[PDB]
Symmetry: C3
Subunit: 30 residues, 3 copies
């Protein structure tokens, strides 16, 4: 129903996925 | 014209780019 | 105040973070 709210949530989900990738690179020492 | 529609599409495009990175890490065995 | 404007900016910020990851993979030769 509230698509703008949904995009805010979607952006947060994608932020968490990018953060997990950044952290993975750090943790695996690339 | 419909900027909220455009942000939905943009989020989908970024999702595909993050997915490609996740898959690359897996495929290259990091 | 203008949440749709804010999501456009947020998407741009996430795009820059994904781009930095893509470039990192290239530069580190994975």
């Amino acid at each position: 129903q509230h698509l703008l709210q949904l995009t805010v949530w979607g952006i947060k989900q994608l932020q968490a996925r990018i953060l997990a990738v950044e952290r993975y690179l750090k943790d695996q020492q690339l």
